[PDB]
């Protein structure tokens, strides 16, 4: 049967979670997508010759630490933790997202990729070295993306699928 992989995209508002997701789903850059919309989208993709079904949850909205939200995030098998390379605050929030994932999955080994988005922009405030070193601290991959140009998009999502396969 075709394996389905439940992937969750997290990170500060405005980093490009929706743009990245819609790039994967539509193969089109969408510069405007209602920042409140949290939803899930499926795509069949060929990853290393295997057609698998991706189910991507593009998260949005305020923090909610209810039992219900924790149960829903626990459905995720892997997580993209996204920051924007021109927004320091978004990078400094990454540890919070990683800590919430570790808590809800009750594991120090959750499949995860660190994503530095907006790589097409000239306004960098987060050095690539600093981001690579954060991923090294966590023992996870780091991928540089642009939802605008499609740089890194398959790399981010497909690496996460390979991380889940190694974990299973
Ligand atoms: C960085 C902080 C603190 N300063 C203000 C901004 N902020 C913030 N804003 C908005 C959202 C969040 C935030 N944290 O974790 C999560 C997620 C979706 C990540 C995946 C695992 C779980 S499990 C659970 N119940 C979740 C929630 N709600 C989450 N989302 N964090
Ligand atoms: N230049 C550029 N802008 C982007 C990129 N990804 C998203 N954006 C812009 O960043 C803003 C937030 O994107 P959005 O996908 O709504 O972020 P979300 O709140 O994390 O879902 C919008 O103004 C998008 O046009 C990217 O890779 N490059
Ligand atoms: Mg969004």
Curated annotation (Swiss-Prot):
Compartment(s) of residence: Cell membrane; Endomembrane system; Cytoplasm, Cytosol
Positions contributing to GTP binding: 11-19, 30-36, 60-61, 117-120
GO CC, one annotated term: cytoplasm
Post-translational modification N-acetylmethionine, affected residues: 2
UniProt-listed Enzyme Commission number(s): 3.6.5.2
Highest taxon of the lineage: Eukaryota
GO MF term set: G protein activity; GDP binding; GMP binding; GTP binding; GTPase activity; identical protein binding; LRR domain binding; protein-containing complex binding
Catalytic activity: GTP + H2O = GDP + phosphate + H(+)
SUPFAM superfamilies found in the cross-reference section: P-loop containing nucleoside triphosphate hydrolases
GTP-binding recorded as keyword: yes
Residues where N6-acetyllysine is found: 105
Quaternary structure and interacting proteins, as annotated: Interacts with PHLPP. Interacts (active GTP-bound form preferentially) with RGS14. Interacts (when farnesylated) with PDE6D; this promotes dissociation from the cell membrane. Interacts with SOS1. Interacts (when farnesylated) with GPR31. Interacts with RAP1GDS1. Interacts (active GTP-bound form) with both SHOC2 and PP1c (all isoforms) to form a tertiary complex; SHOC2 and PP1c preferably bind M-Ras/MRAS, but they also bind K-Ras/KRAS, N-Ras/NRAS and H-Ras/HRAS. Interacts (GTP-bound form) with MAPKAP1/SIN1; inhibiting K-Ras/KRAS activity.
Similarity annotation: Belongs to the small GTPase superfamily. Ras family.
Name the record gives this protein: GTPase KRas
Gene this chain is encoded by: KRAS
């Amino acid at each position: 049967g075709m394996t389905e992989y439940k992937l969750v995209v997290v990170g500060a508002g405005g980093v490009g979670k929706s743009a990245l997701t819609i790039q994967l789903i539509q193969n089109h850059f969408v510069d405007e997508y209602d920042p409140t919309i949290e939803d899930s989208y499926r795509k069949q993709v060929v990853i290393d010759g295997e057609t698998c079904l991706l189910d991507i949850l593009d998260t949005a909205g305020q923090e909610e630490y209810s039992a219900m939200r924790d149960q829903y995030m626990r459905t995720g098998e892997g997580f993209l933790c996204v920051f924007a390379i021109n927004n320091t605050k978004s990078f400094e929030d990454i540890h919070h997202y990683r800590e919430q994932i570790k808590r809800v999955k009750d594991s120090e080994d959750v499949p995860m990729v660190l994503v530095g988005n907006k790589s097409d922009l000239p306004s960098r405030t987060v050095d690539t070295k600093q981001a690579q070193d954060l991923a090294r601290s966590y023992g996870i991959p780091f991928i540089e993306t642009s939802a605008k140009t499609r740089q890194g998009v398959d790399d981010a999502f497909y690496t996460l699928v390979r991380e889940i396969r190694k974990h299973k």
